[PDB]
Design an enzyme around this catalytic site. Structure first.
Site, PDB file in Angstrom:
ATOM      1  CE  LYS A 170      -3.800   2.534   0.043  1.00 46.07           C
ATOM      2  NZ  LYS A 170      -4.483   2.849  -1.250  1.00 46.07           N
ATOM      3  CE  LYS A 234      -3.462   7.400   7.168  1.00 46.13           C
ATOM      4  NZ  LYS A 234      -4.136   6.623   6.081  1.00 46.13           N
TER       5      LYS A 234
END
Ligand SMILES: NC(=O)c1ccc[n+]([C@@H]2O[C@H](COP(=O)([O-])OP(=O)(O)OC[C@H]3O[C@@H](n4cnc5c(N)ncnc54)[C@H](OP(=O)(O)O)[C@@H]3O)[C@@H](O)[C@H]2O)c1
Length: 279
Positions: A170, A234
């Site tokens: 990811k 983030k």
């Protein structure tokens, strides 16, 4: 195979609906009660806490914003850990990092709870259509055991390896996504400055995932997520943390981080990532 779903956001809501449609959804949890309402209306048990949810299911899926939010949901005073029986499986599907995934797994095993990191790609459209790509870290036996559940939400289901390996994949994905998105926004900024025909610009460019998913919104001035800029921010921080740990220089990812950190600072953290430089 009873599933409890925690976090009914932009991804979480339609994801949980897929599981309901497949016969796996037994219970949901959301911090904000209102979002549970369509699930209650379909007879889904709405839990009073993650602990209350965990008590009632075999698998807990977490689709919440950031690692501290996963921590709270798992390990808070009424966290999963307080209601789970040994044997429960936790599946973290939101995005954080390999190190976080390994800490979640370590802490959870103290309770006899199993853990997979299974973050996803395909955005809001993929979650709605059930065509998400799913990239899974953890026990390979648990991967195989959960495959019908994963198949309810996505299409391309991929086992990456040990815990943390889903998050690894990811983070790699997010690097590509950030820069593809910067690539589009910059292209369009130049097109606009050169007085070009947007319909033609769209034709020529349609190429990347970002352009496919977000260009038609951008051209309409629909700046709504989609995928929130604060979330990409983030993700990129985790990216740069991992890059620093391993001495890799990613100056593209670093610029992307700055640009998104700025968008968050400017008060646009809640807009789609596609709104960069247009907000
Ligand atoms: N949208 C995308 O394109 C996309 C694609 C792949 C992956 N992701 C990742 O998937 C995750 C969720 O994305 P989203 O787009 O669904 O975000 P979102 O729409 O902002 O939803 C965030 C969800 O997390 C819940 N939440 C946040 N902090 C919490 C806490 N401390 N305790 C309990 N619940 C908490 C929120 O509850 P409330 O409803 O109470 O606010 C909401 O349900 C993120 O990790 C994101 O980076 C997003």
């Amino acid at each position: 195979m009873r599933v409890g779903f925690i976090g009914l956001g932009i991804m979480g809501g339609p994801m949980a609906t897929h599981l309901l449609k497949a016969g796996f959804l037994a219970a949901v949890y959301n911090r904000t009660r209102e979002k549970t309402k369509p699930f209650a209306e379909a007879g889904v048990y709405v839990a009073e806490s993650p602990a209350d949810l965990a008590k009632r299911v075999d698998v807990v899926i977490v689709m919440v914003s950031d690692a501290p939010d996963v921590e709270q949901v798992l390990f808070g005073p009424s966290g999963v850990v307080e209601g789970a029986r040994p044997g429960l499986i936790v599946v973290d599907m939101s995005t954080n990092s390999p190190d976080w995934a390994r800490k979640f797994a370590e802490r959870l095993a103290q309770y006899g709870i199993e853990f997979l990191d299974a973050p996803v790609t395909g955005g809001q459209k993929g979650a709605i259509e059930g065509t998400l790509t799913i990239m899974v870290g953890g026990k390979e036996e648990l991967f195989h055991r959960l495959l019908p559940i994963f198949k309810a939400m996505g299409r391309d289901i991929v086992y990456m390896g040990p815990v943390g390996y889903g998050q690894a994949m990811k983070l790699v994905n997010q690097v590509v996504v950030a820069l593809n998105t910067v690539a589009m926004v910059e292209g369009l900024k130049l097109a606009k400055a050169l007085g070009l025909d947007m319909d033609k610009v769209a034709e020529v460019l349609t190429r990347s995932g970002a352009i496919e998913l977000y260009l038609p919104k951008l051209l309409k001035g629909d700046l709504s997520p989609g995928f929130k800029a604060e979330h990409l921010k983030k993700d990129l921080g985790y990216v740069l943390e991992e890059a620093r740990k391993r001495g890799v220089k990613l100056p593209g990812a670093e610029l992307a981080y700055e640009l998104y950190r700025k968008m968050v600072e400017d008060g646009a953290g809640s807009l789609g990532i596609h709104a960069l430089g247009f907000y």
